[PDB]
């Protein structure tokens, strides 16, 4: 009966989960655990090049707490 | 090369330039300035105008050349062309040549060589883009401006149904 | 035919745009914002005959601010002889200019 | 047309002008010359036949080439500037381009090609609004940037224009025709002048538009667009060709007539700068514009041509026509050579 | 740079999948002008350059000077208005409405 | 690893494509008393497979069009416009994360009109030509209540970020303070999709030259629109819960709910005769472009008067 | 609900801003330090660079004015690799 | 024209402030208010002098006075502010909304301990 | 100068060239008039990026708005024309020459 | 004035909506109690940074801390 179309809104609805959930886990790989940083102003990319000079490994993902202060 | 990157889209630029400027068809020509508002817009970019870039890509491309092509699919339905191609396009690559191999040049104003990466500023904006808080201050500064060019717009309304109508 | 409407009914038409150094949005300022400022202050009421020998020195340099052609000149000439030595082996460059030193802050 | 859009039409034609003499920036410059042309493009297609199609094709390919040559000066001013203020230019290549946009939108030659073409197409009434409000906003411009026009440019249009718009009115029997290349000499009367005293500039712009407007409300009062028709104007209208007769002869600039106020003074000008040659070249030049007038006062007032039988029908019925301030026009441009110090009013 | 590269991606993948579908099956042997089309074109590109005024409004929202941006939007949004109106009352919507 | 994420993203649009195919036979088979395709695959999973390898051997129709190069071109500019549409789309997070997202979409869709003139006049057939100026001169006019419309909804948003789309929405959907606008933009975008009721390219009162291949491409391209058009108007006006250590319930969400419009528009699709192309160009020009004009002096007065001016960053 | 959200959206992004506001003086005196390390770095490279050149004055400017100019990015930059070149130039508009 | 001047190597060398901006915007609000007056002093002599030579040694205070607020914190409430920048941390954007609690434990320990 | 100048300036100058070197139709001119434009956008749009003028960043889209109006009036024109004769040649505008 | 409303409203609701809509965007603004606070929330938002003043002596308004009590407050956005 109508549960007939279902199968195939399974199969399309799987394959419209598939890359949100694909960038997702790709930037929680890609930047240490963590959501990409967003910079759409230049204040936000000016902080994350800071951190990526900061962290000494040149990523700017790594972050550095008090112990790298004395 | 990739720090050449605003000079080699110019270059695509010029070529799309003499591309439809040779003039071999109004449909052709039509697509060749389409490439040269793509890469014009990626120029625009590439110096920090997402907005004016997207400008060319809506309102250039979008709204103007679809009306050039739509109107020339309505009204349409060689050794002259490929020379003149030929022609613009050695100009532009012994520019291109001269520039490179002097990293100065002198056509009619003098020319650097150098990527056009040199002439940029080195700090940031804070929490704004410069150029949309200026395209934003045409509703606060801009109050003549605005009203002369939805004048013009108007009044073009008007003349383009004046002309067309033939009474 | 200058018609100096604005100024006989005290608005501002296009007075805004007209220099970098107008009130920006913001208080931005323009890259050649005391260059301009400058400029435009030696070259004021004195007419613009008196201007072009008077205000010379300051117009070249926000010209220069403008457009940097003596900068990208010099820099030609740096980056030149640095390639120059380069290719006749008689310098290296530092480990600071060549990306091994982790940067300041 | 619907008068209210005619109206509103010419309105935005006297608004694009109005913005171009009011305004500081070169953007609002480049907008009134662009609000200009898209308001006076109907104007030109008022009468809708192929003629008048062709001419505003032309008319809109050469004012739109003129401006964006313009907006390609304003964006190398401001390269080498930094700024918009309507003003000198602050590089040679930019002057060049405005000289060159400038002359074009006057229809200076060599690029005055466009001016007897589009002004035989269009009526006689948007040939009036082409060949005298179409002149002020480019002159304005003119006017403010003449610390930076070049001297051999401005004086080689001027001359160009001079003496091409003297040998091209000599081949005419259209009326049209005639004003146009009239007015391609006058404009290098006023751009001769330009560099010099700004004032004179003005003058003559002030006198050529009264006996322009003084011509082509005498050609509209009468409907002549040829000179055999005006040369039936004697049977119809006596008066009028009385008042063609001296205002053609003001035209070349016979004294005591008020057209000879303006090249006098230009003389005057010229002469205090040590120029003789140029100015004496371009009076003597100036002497082709007064053969086709004459050409023109000797078909029209001086003789009686051959009329029709038809027009005893015309004997019947007065001119309804609004001759609007013909006869103020005629005054002001025949006796006004008593009060030529009366031009210190435009200092 | 990654914006780029996926415009080459899917430029790349729309040409394969353009190339596959002119030469995989090769294996196998085997007007008269409109005036209203144009008019609605004009009309398109006048009130899209009208749009093109109308989109910094988000921006132009933020500023201090509101009474005066809010006349100029409202101002620019009636405008448009009066261009569809006068193309209303003057039949140029018609048949094509 | 990028290049991972953008295959990840453009592939599953051709597979969800390729089985929308059968979403809409079968849902069109049971809202006209039938079945759909059951026979091929089980439950008929198999008849977009079957479909795809008969139209990719199927014999070409061999034109002789009056340009090759822009008849290669419309369906490479179709394919590459509607993948192009999805990259900046939130969900939860954007493959580009761009800060003007909604105006590159706007621009990229009105670059779409190229492949349809394209098309119709690399065809040989005048009528083809007339059929095609006709689909341009539809989108265009829908094109403006899409700009218009979507800058009124973004006068609540405060920038043109897709992604802050989803913070605007975190109280209430947006199609509470925007239905009228949610309505009209859902007919326009159904509209620009030469969609039923308004698919005039499939009624007897532009691009039949191509062979069965490129019209599949074209094809394929036109529900990559169509489900994208969804998906943005599912983000524009029914935005989802968004945890930020738990993603996958925004796309669970976002998901459901573009599936759900996907099939309004095959409901909207089985119910309804077209208009006639006057009908539809009095629907946008008279009915669609004043309401819009209204609602966009409502939306940028409404946040000044009620202090609800969003932010920009 | 919109004018309740919008109205907390603004105080929240008055806190983001005070925040960029209380940390921009230690960035300040960071990119201070970071351009003069750069320009002094310039400098005496040129030094060691410019010797054969007659006429050359190490570090001359090209300004008549003695007022600091702010450095320009081939000022910065141009004696340093590729790769530093196109992050510090073209980071921000290629991000994302 | 003239020789530039600039200062030495050894004149630009400072104690640097080694965290990361989610350190630093977890620290924001009473980093200024606690180091509120180099810091105000540094800006001052910034936009009055126009020139970063003729600002170093203030420039040097508020790189001095930032350590000592970041020791003071890792002295008492280290572990509190280290649950709230992770927390920070975490997001693209960085919200402060996201992480009120930990803000509410590091606000309380530093209003008690400090 | 900066070396794309060159590139955007030379643009202007070939699309100069080909609007003042007609083949035979109107349209061609058309393009080439919009190419002019185009390049002249580009280029103030360079200079107010590269300046950080802020506020003559809306100058270009004016410069935009004002150009494909007066496009739009172009290809009025070049209807009527085309609604005169059949095509957009340039060489049936020819009789304004008597 | 009503039956021609009611005319209007029978024949043509879109247009009657639409100048409804338009005729509510230009003048409730004027109206409404909460325009003022557009403007305050506008200009209390801070974009730039708060440059000091140089101390001369007499400044009693301007504070010496942000956490004085004089300066401009923002309790009335906390609050509204
Ligand atoms: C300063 C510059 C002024 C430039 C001229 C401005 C007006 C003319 C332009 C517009 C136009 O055509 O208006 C109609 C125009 C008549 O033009 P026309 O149709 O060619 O005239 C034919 C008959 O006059 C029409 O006869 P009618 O039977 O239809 O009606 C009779 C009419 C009835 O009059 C009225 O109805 C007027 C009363 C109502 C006026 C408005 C009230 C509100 O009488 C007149 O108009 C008499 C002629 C007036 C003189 C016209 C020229 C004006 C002087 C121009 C400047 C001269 C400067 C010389 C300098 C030389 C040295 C450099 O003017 C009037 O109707 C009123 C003239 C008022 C002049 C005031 C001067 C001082 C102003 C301060
Ligand atoms: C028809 C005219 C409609 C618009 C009228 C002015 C609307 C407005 O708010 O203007 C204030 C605005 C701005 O005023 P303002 O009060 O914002 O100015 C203060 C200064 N700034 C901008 C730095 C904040 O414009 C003006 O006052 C001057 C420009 C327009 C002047 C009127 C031109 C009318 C031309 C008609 C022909
Ligand atoms: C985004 C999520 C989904 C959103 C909703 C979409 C789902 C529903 C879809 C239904 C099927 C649609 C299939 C296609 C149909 C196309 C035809 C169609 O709809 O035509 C539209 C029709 C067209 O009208 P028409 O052509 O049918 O009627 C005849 C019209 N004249 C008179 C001109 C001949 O209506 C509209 O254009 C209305 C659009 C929406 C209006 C919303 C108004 C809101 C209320 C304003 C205030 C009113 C009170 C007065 C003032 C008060 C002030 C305080
Ligand atoms: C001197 C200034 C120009 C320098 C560059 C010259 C480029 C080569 C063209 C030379 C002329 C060749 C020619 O045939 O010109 C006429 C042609 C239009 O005439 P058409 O009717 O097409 O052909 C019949 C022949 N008259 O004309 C054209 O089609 C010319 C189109 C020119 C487009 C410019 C392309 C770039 C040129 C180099 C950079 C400047
Ligand atoms: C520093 C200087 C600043 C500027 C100073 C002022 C400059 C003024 C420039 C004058 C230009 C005037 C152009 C003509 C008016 C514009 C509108 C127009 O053309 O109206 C004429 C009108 C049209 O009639 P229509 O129906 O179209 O005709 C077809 C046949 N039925 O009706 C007719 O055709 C009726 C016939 C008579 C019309 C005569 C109009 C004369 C106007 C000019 C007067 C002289 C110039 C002003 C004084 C000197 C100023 C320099
Ligand atoms: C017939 C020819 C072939 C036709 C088929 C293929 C072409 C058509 C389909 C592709 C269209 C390409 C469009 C390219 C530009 C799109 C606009 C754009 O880049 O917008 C996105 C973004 C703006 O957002 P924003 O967040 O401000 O930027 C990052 C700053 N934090 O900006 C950015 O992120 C900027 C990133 C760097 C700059 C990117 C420049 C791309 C290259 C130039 C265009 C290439 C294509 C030219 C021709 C296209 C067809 C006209
Ligand atoms: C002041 C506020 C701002 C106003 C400007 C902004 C408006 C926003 C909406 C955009 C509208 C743009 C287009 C308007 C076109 C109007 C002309 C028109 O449509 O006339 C024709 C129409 C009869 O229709 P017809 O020609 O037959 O078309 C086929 C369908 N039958 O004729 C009619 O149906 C008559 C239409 C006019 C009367 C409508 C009255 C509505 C009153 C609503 C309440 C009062 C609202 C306050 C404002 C005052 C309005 C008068
Ligand atoms: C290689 C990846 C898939 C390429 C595209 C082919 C499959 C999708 C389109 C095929 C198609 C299907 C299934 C289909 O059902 C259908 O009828 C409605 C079509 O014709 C209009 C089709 O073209």
């Given at each position: 009966?109508?549960?007939?179309?279902?199968?195939?809104?399974?199969?399309?609805?799987?394959?419209?989960?598939?890359?949100?959930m694909?960038?997702?886990?790709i930037?929680?790989?890609?930047?240490?655990?963590?959501?990409?940083?967003?910079?759409?102003?230049?204040?936000?990319?000016?902080?994350?090049?800071?951190?990526?000079?900061?962290?000494?490994?040149?990523?700017?993902?790594?972050?550095?707490?008090?112990?790298?202060?004395? | 090369?990739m720090?050449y990157?605003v000079?080699?889209?110019?270059?695509?630029?010029?070529?799309?330039?003499?591309?439809?400027?040779?003039?071999?068809?109004?449909?052709?020509?039509?697509?060749?300035?389409?490439?040269?508002?793509?890469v014009g817009?990626?120029?625009?970019?590439?110096?920090?105008?997402?907005?004016?870039?997207?400008?060319?890509?809506?309102?250039?491309?979008?709204?103007?050349?679809?009306?050039?092509?739509?109107?020339?699919?309505?009204?349409?339905?060689?050794?002259?062309?490929?020379?003149?191609?030929?022609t613009?396009?050695?100009?532009?690559?012994?520019?291109?040549?001269?520039?490179?191999?002097?990293?100065?040049?002198?056509?009619?104003?003098?020319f650097?060589?150098?990527?056009?990466?040199?002439?940029?500023?080195?700090?940031?904006?804070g929490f704004?883009?410069?150029?949309?808080?200026?395209?934003?201050?045409?509703?606060?500064?801009?109050?003549?401006?605005?009203?002369?060019?939805?004048?013009?717009?108007?009044?073009?309304?008007?003349?383009?149904?004046?002309?067309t109508?033939?009474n | 035919?200058?018609?100096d409407?604005?100024?006989?009914?005290?608005?501002?038409?296009?007075?805004?745009?007209?220099?970098?150094?107008?009130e920006?949005?913001?208080?931005?300022?323009?890259?050649?914002?005391?260059?301009?400022?400058?400029?435009?202050?030696?070259?004021?009421?004195?007419?613009?005959?008196?201007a072009?020998?008077?205000?010379?020195?300051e117009?070249?340099?926000?010209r220069?601010c403008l457009?940097?052609?003596?900068?990208?000149?010099?820099?030609?000439?740096?980056?030149?002889?640095?390639?120059?030595?380069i290719?006749?082996?008689?310098?290296?460059?530092?480990?600071?200019?060549?990306?091994?030193?982790?940067?300041?802050? | 047309?619907?008068?209210?859009?005619?109206?509103?039409?010419?309105?935005?034609?006297?608004?694009?002008?109005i913005?171009?003499?009011?305004?500081?920036?070169?953007?609002?410059?480049?907008?009134?010359?662009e609000?200009?042309?898209?308001?006076?493009?109907?104007?030109?297609?008022?009468?809708?036949?192929?003629?008048?199609?062709?001419?505003?094709?032309?008319?809109?390919?050469?004012?739109?080439?003129?401006?964006?040559?313009?907006?390609?000066?304003?964006?190398?001013?401001?390269?080498?500037?930094?700024?918009?203020?309507?003003?000198?230019?602050?590089?040679?290549?930019?002057?060049?381009?405005?000289?060159?946009?400038?002359?074009?939108?006057?229809?200076?030659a060599?690029?005055?090609?466009?001016?007897?073409?589009?002004?035989?197409?269009?009526?006689?009434?948007?040939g009036?609004?082409?060949?005298?409000?179409?002149?002020?906003?480019?002159?304005?411009?003119?006017?403010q940037i003449?610390?930076?026009?070049?001297?051999?440019?401005?004086?080689?249009?001027?001359?160009?224009?001079?003496?091409?718009?003297?040998?091209?009115?000599?081949?005419?029997?259209?009326?049209?025709?005639?004003?146009?290349?009239?007015?391609?000499?006058?404009?290098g009367?006023?751009?001769?002048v330009?560099?010099?005293?700004?004032?004179?500039?003005?003058?003559?712009?002030?006198?050529?538009?009264?006996?322009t407007?003084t011509?082509?409300?005498?050609?509209?009062?009468?409907?002549?667009?040829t000179?055999?028709?005006?040369?039936?104007?004697?049977?119809?209208?006596?008066?009028?060709?009385?008042?063609?007769?001296?205002?053609?002869?003001?035209?070349?600039?016979?004294?005591?007539?008020?057209?000879?106020?303006?090249?006098?003074?230009?003389?005057?000008?010229m002469?205090?700068?040590?120029?003789?040659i140029?100015?004496?070249?371009?009076?003597?030049?100036?002497?082709?514009?007064?053969?086709?007038?004459?050409?023109?006062?000797?078909?029209?007032?001086?003789?009686?041509?051959?009329?029709?039988?038809?027009?005893?029908?015309?004997?019947?019925?007065?001119?309804?026509?609004?001759?609007?301030?013909?006869?103020?026009?005629?005054?002001?441009?025949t006796?006004?050579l008593?009060?030529t110090?009366?031009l210190?009013?435009?200092? | 740079?990654?914006?780029?590269?996926?415009?080459?991606?899917?430029?790349?993948?729309?040409?394969?999948?353009?190339?596959?579908?002119?030469?995989?099956?090769?294996?196998?042997?085997?007007?008269?002008?409109?005036?209203?089309?144009?008019?609605?074109?004009?009309?398109?590109?006048?009130?899209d350059?009208?749009?093109?005024?109308?989109?910094?409004?988000?921006?132009?929202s933020?500023?201090?000077?509101?009474?005066?941006?809010?006349?100029?939007?409202?101002?620019?949004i009636?405008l448009?208005?009066?261009?569809?109106?006068?193309?209303?009352?003057?039949?140029?919507?018609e048949?094509?409405? | 690893?990028?290049?991972?994420?953008?295959?990840?993203?453009?592939?599953?649009?051709?597979?969800?494509?390729?089985?929308?195919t059968?979403?809409?036979?079968?849902?069109?088979?049971?809202?006209?008393?039938?079945?759909?395709?059951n026979?091929?695959?089980?439950?008929?999973?198999?008849?977009?497979?079957?479909?795809?390898?008969?139209?990719?051997?199927?014999?070409?129709?061999?034109?002789?069009?009056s340009?090759?190069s822009?008849?290669?071109?419309?369906?490479?500019?179709?394919?590459?416009?509607?993948?192009?549409?999805?990259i900046?789309?939130?969900?939860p997070?954007?493959?580009?994360?761009?800060?003007?997202?909604?105006?590159?979409?706007?621009?990229?869709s009105?670059?779409?009109?190229?492949?349809?003139?394209?098309?119709?006049?690399?065809?040989?057939?005048?009528?083809?030509?007339?059929?095609?100026?006709?689909?341009?001169?539809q989108?265009?006019?829908?094109?403006?209540?899409?700009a218009?419309?979507?800058?009124?909804?973004?006068?609540?948003?405060?920038?043109?970020?897709?992604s802050?789309?989803?913070?605007?929405?975190?109280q209430?959907?947006?199609?509470?303070?925007?239905?009228?606008?949610?309505?009209?933009?859902?007919?326009?975008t159904?509209?620009?999709?030469?969609?039923?009721?308004?698919?005039?390219?499939?009624?007897?009162?532009?691009?039949?030259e191509?062979?069965?291949?490129?019209?599949?491409?074209?094809?394929?391209?036109?529900?990559?629109?169509?489900?994208?058009?969804?998906?943005?108007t599912?983000?524009?006006?029914?935005?989802?819960?968004?945890?930020?250590?738990?993603?996958?319930?925004?796309?669970?969400?976002?998901?459901?709910?573009?599936?759900?419009?996907?099939?309004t528009?095959?409901?909207?699709?089985?119910?309804?005769?077209?208009?006639?192309?006057?009908?539809?160009?009095?629907?946008?020009?008279?009915?669609?472009?004043?309401?819009?004009?209204?609602l966009?002096?409502?939306?940028?007065?409404?946040?000044?008067?009620?202090?609800?001016?969003?932010?920009?960053? | 609900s919109?004018?309740?959200?919008?109205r907390?959206?603004?105080?929240?992004?008055?806190?983001?801003?005070?925040?960029?506001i209380?940390?921009?003086?230690?960035?300040?005196?960071?990119?201070?330090?970071?351009?003069?390390?750069?320009?002094?770095?310039?400098?005496?490279?040129?030094?060691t660079?410019?010797?054969?050149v007659?006429?050359?004055?190490?570090?001359?400017?090209?300004?008549?004015?003695?007022?600091?100019?702010?450095?320009?990015?081939?000022?910065?930059?141009?004696?340093?690799?590729?790769?530093?070149?196109?992050?510090?130039?073209?980071?921000?508009?290629?991000?994302? | 024209?003239?020789?530039?001047?600039?200062?030495?190597?050894?004149?630009?060398?400072?104690?640097?402030?080694?965290?990361?901006?989610?350190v630093?915007?977890?620290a924001?609000?009473?980093?200024?208010?606690?180091?509120?007056?180099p810091?105000?002093?540094?800006?001052?002599?910034?936009?009055?002098?126009?020139?970063?030579?003729?600002?170093?040694?203030?420039?040097?205070?508020?790189?001095?006075?930032?350590?000592?607020?970041?020791?003071?914190?890792?002295?008492?409430?280290?572990?509190?502010?280290?649950?709230?920048?992770?927390?920070?941390?975490?997001?693209?954007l960085?919200?402060?909304?996201?992480?009120?609690?930990?803000?509410?434990?590091?606000?309380?320990?530093?209003?008690?301990?400090? | 100068?900066?070396?794309?100048?060159?590139?955007?300036?030379?643009?202007?100058?070939?699309?100069?060239?080909?609007?003042?070197?007609?083949?035979?139709?109107?349209?061609?001119?058309?393009?080439?008039?919009?190419?002019?434009?185009?390049?002249?956008?580009?280029?103030?749009?360079?200079?107010?990026?590269?300046?950080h003028?802020?506020?003559?960043?809306?100058?270009?889209?004016?410069?935009?708005?004002?150009?494909?109006?007066?496009?739009?009036?172009?290809?009025?024109?070049?209807?009527?024309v085309?609604?005169?004769?059949?095509?957009?040649?340039?060489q049936?505008?020819?009789?304004?020459?008597? | 004035?009503?039956?021609?409303?009611?005319?209007?409203?029978?024949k043509?609701?879109?247009?009657?909506?639409?100048?409804?809509?338009?005729?509510?965007?230009?003048?409730?603004?004027?109206?409404?109690?909460?325009?003022?606070?557009?403007?305050?929330?506008?200009?209390?938002?801070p974009?730039?940074?708060?440059?000091?003043?140089?101390?001369?002596?007499?400044?009693?308004?301007?504070?010496?801390?942000?956490?004085?009590?004089?300066?401009?407050?923002?309790?009335?956005?906390?609050?509204?």
């Open positions: 009966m109508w549960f007939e179309v279902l199968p195939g809104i399974a199969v399309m609805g799987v394959c419209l989960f598939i890359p949100g694909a960038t997702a886990r930037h929680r790989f890609s930047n240490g655990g963590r959501e990409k940083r967003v910079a759409h102003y230049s204040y936000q990319w000016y902080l994350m090049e800071r951190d990526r000079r900061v962290s000494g490994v040149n990523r700017y993902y790594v972050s550095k707490g008090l112990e790298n202060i004395d | 090369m720090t990157i000079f080699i889209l110019s270059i695509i630029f010029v070529m799309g330039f003499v591309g439809f400027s040779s003039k071999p068809s109004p449909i052709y020509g039509g697509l060749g300035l389409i490439v040269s508002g793509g817009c990626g120029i625009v970019l590439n110096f920090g105008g997402s907005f004016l870039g997207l400008m060319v890509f809506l309102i250039y491309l979008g709204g103007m050349m679809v009306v050039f092509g739509y109107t020339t699919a309505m009204a349409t339905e060689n050794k002259v062309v490929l020379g003149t191609f030929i613009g396009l050695l100009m532009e690559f012994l520019m291109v040549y001269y520039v490179l191999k002097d990293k100065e040049v002198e056509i009619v104003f003098k650097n060589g150098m990527g056009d990466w040199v002439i940029y500023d080195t700090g940031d904006s704004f883009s410069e150029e949309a808080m200026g395209i934003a201050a045409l509703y606060s500064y801009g109050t003549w401006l605005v009203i002369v060019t939805g004048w013009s717009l108007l009044i073009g309304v008007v003349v383009i149904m004046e002309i109508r033939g | 035919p200058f018609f409407v604005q100024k006989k009914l005290g608005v501002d038409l296009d007075h805004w745009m007209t220099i970098q150094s107008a920006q949005p913001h208080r931005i300022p323009a890259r050649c914002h005391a260059f301009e400022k400058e400029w435009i202050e030696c070259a004021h009421g004195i007419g613009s005959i008196r072009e020998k008077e205000c010379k020195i117009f070249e340099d926000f220069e457009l940097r052609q003596k900068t990208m000149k010099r820099l030609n000439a740096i980056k030149r002889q640095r390639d120059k030595l290719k006749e082996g008689k310098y290296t460059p530092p480990p600071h200019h060549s990306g091994q030193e982790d940067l300041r802050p | 047309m619907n008068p209210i859009i005619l109206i509103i039409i010419l309105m935005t034609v006297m608004l694009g002008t913005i171009v003499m009011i305004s500081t920036h070169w953007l609002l410059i480049w907008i009134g010359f609000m200009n042309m898209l308001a006076i493009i109907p104007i030109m297609m008022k009468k809708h036949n192929p003629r008048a199609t062709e001419a505003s094709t032309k008319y809109f390919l050469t004012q739109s080439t003129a401006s964006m040559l313009l907006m390609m000066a304003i964006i190398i001013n401001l390269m080498f500037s930094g700024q918009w203020t309507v003003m000198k230019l602050f590089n040679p290549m930019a002057s060049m381009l405005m000289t060159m946009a400038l002359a074009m939108k006057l229809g200076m060599p690029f005055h090609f466009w001016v007897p073409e589009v002004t035989q197409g269009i009526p006689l009434s948007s009036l609004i082409l060949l005298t409000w179409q002149k002020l906003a480019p002159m304005s411009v003119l006017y003449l610390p930076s026009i070049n001297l051999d440019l401005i004086l080689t249009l001027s001359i160009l224009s001079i003496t091409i718009g003297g040998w091209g009115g000599l081949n005419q029997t259209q009326l049209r025709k005639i004003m146009a290349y009239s007015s391609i000499a006058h404009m009367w006023m751009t001769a330009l560099l010099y005293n700004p004032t004179m500039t003005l003058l003559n712009l002030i006198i050529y538009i009264i006996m407007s011509m082509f409300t005498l050609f509209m009062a009468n409907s002549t667009t000179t055999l028709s005006l040369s039936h104007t004697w049977n119809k209208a006596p008066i009028m060709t009385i008042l063609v007769l001296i205002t053609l002869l003001s035209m070349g600039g016979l004294p005591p007539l008020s057209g000879f106020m303006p090249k006098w003074m230009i003389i005057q000008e002469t205090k700068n040590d120029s003789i140029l100015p004496t070249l371009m009076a003597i030049t100036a002497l082709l514009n007064l053969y086709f007038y004459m050409r023109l006062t000797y078909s029209t007032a001086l003789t009686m041509f051959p009329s029709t039988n038809n027009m005893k029908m015309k004997w019947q019925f007065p001119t309804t026509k609004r001759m609007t301030l013909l006869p103020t026009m005629t005054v002001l441009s006796m006004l008593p009060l110090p009366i210190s009013i435009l200092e | 740079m990654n914006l780029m590269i996926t415009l080459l991606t899917n430029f790349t993948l729309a040409t394969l999948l353009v190339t596959i579908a002119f030469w995989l099956p090769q294996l196998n042997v085997y007007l008269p002008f409109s005036m209203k089309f144009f008019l609605v074109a004009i009309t398109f590109l006048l009130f350059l009208e749009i093109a005024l109308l989109l910094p409004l988000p921006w132009a933020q500023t201090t000077n509101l009474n005066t941006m809010l006349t100029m939007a409202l101002l620019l009636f448009l208005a009066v261009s569809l109106a006068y193309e209303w009352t003057q039949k140029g919507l048949w094509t409405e | 690893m990028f290049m991972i994420n953008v295959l990840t993203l453009i592939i599953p649009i051709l597979l969800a494509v390729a089985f929308l059968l979403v809409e036979r079968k849902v069109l088979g049971y809202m006209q008393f039938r079945k759909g395709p026979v091929v695959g089980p439950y008929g999973l198999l008849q977009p497979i079957a479909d795809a390898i008969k139209l990719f051997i199927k014999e070409p129709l061999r034109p002789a069009t340009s090759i822009m008849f290669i071109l419309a369906p490479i500019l179709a394919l590459t416009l509607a993948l192009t549409m999805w900046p789309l939130p969900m997070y954007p493959l580009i994360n761009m800060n003007l997202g909604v105006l590159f979409m706007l621009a990229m009105s670059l779409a009109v190229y492949s349809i003139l394209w098309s119709g006049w690399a065809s040989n057939s005048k009528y083809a030509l007339i059929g095609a100026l006709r689909a341009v001169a989108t265009i006019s829908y094109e403006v209540t899409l218009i419309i979507l800058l009124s909804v973004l006068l609540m948003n405060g920038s043109f970020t897709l802050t789309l989803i913070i605007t929405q975190e209430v959907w947006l199609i509470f303070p925007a239905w009228p606008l949610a309505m009209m933009w859902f007919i326009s159904l509209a620009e999709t030469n969609r039923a009721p308004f698919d005039l390219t499939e009624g007897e009162s532009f691009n039949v191509y062979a069965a291949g490129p019209f599949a491409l074209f094809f394929m391209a036109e529900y990559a629109n169509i489900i994208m058009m969804n998906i943005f599912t983000t524009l006006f029914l935005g989802a819960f968004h945890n930020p250590y738990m993603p996958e319930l925004y796309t669970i969400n976002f998901t459901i709910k573009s599936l759900l419009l996907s099939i528009f095959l409901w909207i699709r089985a119910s309804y005769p077209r208009f006639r192309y006057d009908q539809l160009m009095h629907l946008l020009w008279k009915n669609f472009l004043p309401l819009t004009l209204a966009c002096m409502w939306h940028v007065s409404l946040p000044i008067l009620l202090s609800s001016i969003p932010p920009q960053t | 919109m004018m309740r959200w919008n907390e959206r603004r105080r929240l992004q008055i806190e983001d801003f005070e925040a960029r209380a940390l921009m003086p230690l960035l300040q005196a960071e990119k201070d330090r970071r351009v003069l390390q750069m320009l002094r770095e310039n400098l005496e490279e040129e030094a660079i410019m010797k054969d007659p006429g050359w004055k190490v570090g001359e400017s090209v300004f008549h004015t003695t007022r600091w100019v702010t450095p320009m990015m081939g000022e910065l930059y141009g004696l340093r690799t590729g790769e530093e070149i196109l992050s510090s130039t073209y980071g921000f508009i290629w991000y994302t | 024209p003239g020789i530039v001047e600039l200062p030495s190597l050894e004149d630009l060398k400072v104690q640097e402030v080694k965290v990361s901006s989610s630093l915007k977890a924001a609000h009473h980093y200024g208010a606690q180091c509120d007056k810091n105000k002093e540094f800006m001052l002599c910034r936009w009055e002098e126009k020139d970063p030579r003729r600002c170093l040694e203030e420039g040097k205070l508020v790189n001095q006075c930032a350590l000592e607020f970041f020791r003071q914190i890792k002295r008492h409430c280290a572990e509190p502010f280290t649950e709230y920048w992770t927390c920070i941390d975490y997001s693209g960085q919200l402060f909304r996201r992480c009120r609690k930990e803000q509410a434990q590091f606000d309380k320990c530093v209003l008690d301990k400090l | 100068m900066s070396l794309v100048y060159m590139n955007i300036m030379m643009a202007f100058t070939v699309s100069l060239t080909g609007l003042l070197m007609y083949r035979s139709h109107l349209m061609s001119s058309l393009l080439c008039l919009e190419g002019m434009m185009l390049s002249l956008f580009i280029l103030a749009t360079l200079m107010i990026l590269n300046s003028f802020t506020l003559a960043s809306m100058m270009p889209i004016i410069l935009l708005v004002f150009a494909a109006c007066e496009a739009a009036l172009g290809l009025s024109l070049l209807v009527m085309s609604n005169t004769y059949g095509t957009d040649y340039v049936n505008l020819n009789l304004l020459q008597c | 004035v009503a039956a021609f409303l009611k005319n209007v409203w029978a043509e609701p879109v247009l009657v909506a639409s100048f409804a809509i338009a005729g509510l965007a230009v003048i409730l603004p004027t109206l409404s109690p909460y325009t003022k606070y557009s403007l305050m929330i506008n200009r209390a938002t974009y730039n940074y708060p440059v000091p003043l140089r101390d001369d002596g007499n400044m009693p308004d301007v504070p010496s801390h942000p956490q004085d009590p004089q300066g401009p407050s923002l309790e009335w956005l906390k609050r509204l």
